[PDB]
């Protein structure tokens, strides 16, 4: 199957591919591949790594919206032969970010994705990474549950907090990435 990550940079994207597959990926070895999209065998699965949404120092606003663009039309052009994908936030700072962006009139990145998503029949799970420093995770995925128009009833199946940085609920992640393989 063909599994797409995808998630704002610095959420720990790098940090959870690598705990469930052990292949380190985006730490430079490969200078260059920063605003591009890299492909990791995972046993006999392949993951397709999008490059990090949004700001990062150094990146030109133009050049965010080039990779955003980039992105969209890989995904549009092979929604037919994605099986799950996985959008990976930072737990703690995307409810703040998302009340701060919508005060301004702006639709969150995170927001956006998730329909996007959607709105091709694409299967998503939601990492909500950085479980270690969120206080009332439960309250973080309603929140966001009810951003991302996501049905009360689906909310468990969606939405899985977990810690990239100290393993906490890995397994369960990749349990419900297969499920959602296999169920589909
Ligand atoms: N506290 C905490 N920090 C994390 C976690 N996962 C990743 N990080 C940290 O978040 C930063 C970005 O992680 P990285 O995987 O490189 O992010 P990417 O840009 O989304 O690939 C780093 O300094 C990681 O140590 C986590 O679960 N908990």
Same mark, same amino acid.
């Given at each position: 199957?063909?599994? @797409?990550? !995808?998630?704002? $940079?610095?959420? &720990? #994207? $790098?940090?959870?591919? *690598?705990?469930? =597959? ?9 200078? %260059?591949?920063?605003? #591009? ?9 392949? +993951?397709?790594?999008?490059?990090? /949404? %949004? ?15 980039? +992105?969209?039309?890989? +995904? ?16 703690? !700072? ?10 301004? &009139?702006?639709?969150? @990145?995170?927001?956006?994705? *998730?329909? /996007?998503?959607?709105?091709?029949? @694409?299967? =998503? +799970?939601? !990492?909500?990474? #950085? ?13 966001? !549950? ?39």
């Amino acid at each position: 199957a063909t599994i @797409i990550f !995808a998630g704002r $940079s610095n959420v &720990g #994207k $790098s940090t959870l591919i *690598y705990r469930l =597959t052990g292949k380190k990926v985006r730490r430079g070895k490969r200078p %260059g591949v920063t605003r #591009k999209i890299i492909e990791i065998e995972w046993k006999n699965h392949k +993951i397709i790594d999008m490059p990090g /949404f %949004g700001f990062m120092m150094g990146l030109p606003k133009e050049v965010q919206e080039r990779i955003k663009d980039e +992105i969209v039309h890989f +995904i549009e052009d092979n929604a037919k032969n994605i099986d799950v994908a996985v959008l990976v936030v930072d737990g703690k !700072a995307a409810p703040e970010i998302i009340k701060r962006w919508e005060k301004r &009139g702006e639709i969150p @990145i995170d927001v956006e994705f *998730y329909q /996007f998503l959607r709105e091709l029949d @694409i299967p =998503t +799970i939601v !990492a909500v990474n #950085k479980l270690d420093k969120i206080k009332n995770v439960q309250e973080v995925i309603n929140f966001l !549950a009810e951003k991302f128009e996501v049905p009360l009833s689906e909310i468990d199946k969606v939405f899985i907090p977990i810690s990239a940085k100290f393993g906490d609920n890995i397994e369960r992640l990749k349990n419900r990435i297969f499920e959602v393989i296999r169920e589909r």
